[PDB]
Structure 1
Amino acid sequence: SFVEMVDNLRGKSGQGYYVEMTVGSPPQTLNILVDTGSSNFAVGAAPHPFLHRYYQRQLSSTYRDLRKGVYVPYTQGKWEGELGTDLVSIPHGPNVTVRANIAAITESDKFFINGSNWEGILGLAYAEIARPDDSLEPFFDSLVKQTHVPNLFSLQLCGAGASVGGSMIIGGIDHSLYTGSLWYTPIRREWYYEVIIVRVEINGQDLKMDCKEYNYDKSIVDSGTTNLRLPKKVFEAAVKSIKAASSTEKFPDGFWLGEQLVCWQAGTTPWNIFPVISLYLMGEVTNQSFRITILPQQYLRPVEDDDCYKFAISQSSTGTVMGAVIMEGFYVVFDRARKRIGFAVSACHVHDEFRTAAVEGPFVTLDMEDCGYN
């Protein structure tokens, strides 16, 4: 649903996943980062040391200026630019063309990456967190309003199998991309893709915190953030257990902070000493939830030059962010029509000789609604 969009994403480890788009008439081709954690469509529109190409408004007979500026601040990077509209399409995407809002980026700081291969960002979340304000229609809303594409997309983000790939199925769910059942969690509110974590286990041991801690101040699925990011108190409980699981090894302190590799001899990575992490999500029926299980092969992410890794779980003071390492090896369905996100085991699942990533349920969990913050 459909073959045409299967394997339509590419990326580098830790630099997001991008999809090919064209903007303007005639079509100008850009690579565009696929970001469930923001809601603005923006594209390099002026030279910058890190851009191979950029969008050229003067060459599009279909460009229209909105004569209004815009800027967006992310966790660290930020850009400013000029709002306009234009015709936009996705070559490996549905067969449609829309007029969508476009921020043309004229200045930026710490936003583009050195050898990135991407030139723009596709914020796929709801108008609410759009900049300057919720009146700037996000691209996906426009796509839905203009064409007949169903109000639904799914993301199959894959780890290696040194440089990566994946699929963005616009408008449905492609059955060849996952196994087992889909389990759905409610979208709590339509701004970020907000969800609610009702329970946390590490190698089968409940973390025993008040479930409010898991969602303080929000939990969101964010394909535009690399790490699993955890609220301070949860982060420290989790590192504690992960340290004691793996104490048979000697770890620098900068490792646990994400600012320093650990290396082992090719093929000898001590997989079995790192615990599995289970996240239980609110389910669709009363008192029911389901779990997703993350393997060490998701949260110790590989970087080149021996097999080398960074700890891809880190600290947040803006809530739980289920980033790209959590999403890898799941097929994640953003079912906007039904205010829900589905998780299944990805067809490109992460393997381990003795353990496997899993979406399992049903589980009973009382008082799930008390887990939400405010």
Structure 2
Amino acid sequence: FVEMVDNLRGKSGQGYYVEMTVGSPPQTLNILVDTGSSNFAVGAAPHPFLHRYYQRQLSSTYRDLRKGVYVPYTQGKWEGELGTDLVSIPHGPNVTVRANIAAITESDKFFINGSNWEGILGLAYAEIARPDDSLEPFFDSLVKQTHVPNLFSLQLCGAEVLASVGGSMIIGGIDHSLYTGSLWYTPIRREWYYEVIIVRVEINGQDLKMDCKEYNYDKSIVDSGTTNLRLPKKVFEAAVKSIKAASSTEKFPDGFWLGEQLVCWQAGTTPWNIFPVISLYLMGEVTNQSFRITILPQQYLRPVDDCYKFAISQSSTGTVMGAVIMEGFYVVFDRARKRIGFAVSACHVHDEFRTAAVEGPFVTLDMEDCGYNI
């Protein structure tokens, strides 16, 4: 899938984007790859933080759906107008799709100063599309209209101005040069978000010993459009307590653990070995099995002297496996078989003593009971 390798770029903390073209003649736009939402939405009018935007009037193939869409979330919102147009991904498959597009005409706290992207590609399912599930998402259109197999995979690599990060979005298959070792799969629990089930969490090999329902309260999702590992309140608190203890040899301000303040060390002296590894055990395809993905401090301390923000934060909407978990790994969104695969990434972080890992099986009792009953 050689022409698709290295087709993602971004700035640390501001997401990964892919170049796309919209309309005829093609308008080039950078689009954030977001497995946590399901709309294809593009800035369509001027904005302080947008260096270009989609101009429907310049496109001979635009069709207006005469329908508005409002997408409030927090910390923000966007609104716009629905239509269809022809869409292609230059460093993607060699196809062109007529896709729904939300042309964003007003927004608050959505576009990001300096991020270099002008729209979002929601890769999750129709159930969470706005205004409702009848607005076919981009990937659904791509699969229906072209032969492309119903699967994509993401290799996010990450790590003055914020550091540039890179990676690859492989549409339609699995590129075996982007990973090493075995691919382990966890089931997609429900096709809305990419919802999965975490059955155990360890911090430096010590079980947090919570009821596993706590890890998925109210859901756990894999989300390339969120930077941090976000954990439900009780789990977050348990985790930081444990990380504090392992690293207690040093002391950092409260704002660092709140992910607000940076912590800096003389360049090159970053004391990685005082921070523990974190293992998340995901439910396997076999009911009583799991496998673990182990992440290093190189993933959960985000570069911003060498300066870092702690990139684990509290959630009130369940666990979010964001970019800093995904950067460990090659992640396969196997929609056709309703499962998500993980393997150690050719661009994983590691030092001479430790490395990200994907290991299994571990046998674990009653993990169907680790979910939330809708």
When the two structures are superposed, what TM-score results if normalisation uses the length of structure 2?
0.98
Asked if structure 1 preserves the Cα contact closer than 8 Å seen for 2:19 and 2:28, the reply is: yes
Q: Deviations over 1:188-219 (max 9, x none)?
A: 00000000000010101000110000000000
What is aligned with 1:202? 203
What is aligned with 2:4? 5
Q: CA deviation at 1:115?
A: 1.1
User: C-alpha distance in 2, partners of 1:74/1:310?
Assistant: 24
User: C-alpha distance in 2, partners of 1:329/1:210?
Assistant: 26
What SS does the aligned partner of 1:260 have? Answer: coil
Q: CA deviation at 1:116?
A: 1.5
Q: CA deviation at 1:286?
A: 3.1
What is aligned with 2:173? 172
When the two structures are superposed, what TM-score results if normalisation uses the length of structure 1?
0.98
Q: Deviations over 1:211-269 (max 9, x none)?
A: 00000000000000000000000000000000111111111011111111000000001
Q: Deviations over 1:286-323 (max 9, x none)?
A: 311100001000000000xx000000000000000000
User: C-alpha distance in 1, partners of 2:117/2:308?
Assistant: 24
Q: Deviations over 1:311-355 (max 9, x none)?
A: 000000000000000000300000000000000000001012211
Q: CA deviation at 1:284?
A: 1.1
What SS does the aligned partner of 2:214 have? Answer: helix
User: C-alpha distance in 1, partners of 2:209/2:328?
Assistant: 27
Asked if structure 1 preserves the Cα contact closer than 8 Å seen for 2:215 and 2:235, the reply is: yes
Q: CA deviation at 1:72?
A: 1.4
- Aligned-residue RMSD, C-alpha: 0.6
Asked if structure 1 preserves the Cα contact closer than 8 Å seen for 2:287 and 2:366, the reply is: no
- Structure 1, gaps ≥5 residues long: none
What is aligned with 1:251? 252
Q: CA deviation at 1:46?
A: 0.4
User: C-alpha distance in 2, partners of 1:77/1:181?
Assistant: 39
User: C-alpha distance in 2, partners of 1:233/1:343?
Assistant: 26
User: C-alpha distance in 2, partners of 1:62/1:332?
Assistant: 34
Asked if structure 2 preserves the Cα contact closer than 8 Å seen for 1:293 and 1:358, the reply is: yes
Q: CA deviation at 1:74?
A: 3.2
Asked if structure 1 preserves the Cα contact closer than 8 Å seen for 2:283 and 2:367, the reply is: yes
User: C-alpha distance in 1, partners of 2:14/2:29?
Assistant: 16
Asked if structure 2 preserves the Cα contact closer than 8 Å seen for 1:40 and 1:139, the reply is: yes
Q: CA deviation at 1:75?
A: 3.3
What SS does the aligned partner of 1:21 have? Answer: strand
User: C-alpha distance in 1, partners of 2:286/2:251?
Assistant: 45
Q: CA deviation at 1:119?
A: 0.3
Asked if structure 2 preserves the Cα contact closer than 8 Å seen for 1:181 and 1:344, the reply is: yes
User: C-alpha distance in 2, partners of 1:77/1:95?
Assistant: 35
User: C-alpha distance in 2, partners of 1:279/1:73?
Assistant: 31
What is aligned with 1:93? 92
Asked if structure 2 preserves the Cα contact closer than 8 Å seen for 1:329 and 1:347, the reply is: no
User: C-alpha distance in 1, partners of 2:360/2:263?
Assistant: 35
What SS does the aligned partner of 1:5 have? Answer: coil
Alignment of 1:143-158 (within 5 A): 143-158=142-157
User: C-alpha distance in 2, partners of 1:372/1:164?
Assistant: 34
Q: Deviations over 1:108-149 (max 9, x none)?
A: 111111112100000000000000000000000000000000
Displacement over 4 Å in runs of 4+? none
Alignment of 1:306-321 (within 5 A): 306-321=305-320
- Structure 2, gaps ≥5 residues long: none
User: C-alpha distance in 1, partners of 2:292/2:210?
Assistant: 17
Q: CA deviation at 1:73?
A: 2.4
Asked if structure 2 preserves the Cα contact closer than 8 Å seen for 1:159 and 1:329, the reply is: no
Alignment length (residue pairs): 370
What SS does the aligned partner of 1:114 have? Answer: coil
Q: Deviations over 1:16-55 (max 9, x none)?
A: 0000000000000000000000000000100100111000
Q: CA deviation at 1:173?
A: 0.5
Asked if structure 2 preserves the Cα contact closer than 8 Å seen for 1:197 and 1:211, the reply is: yes
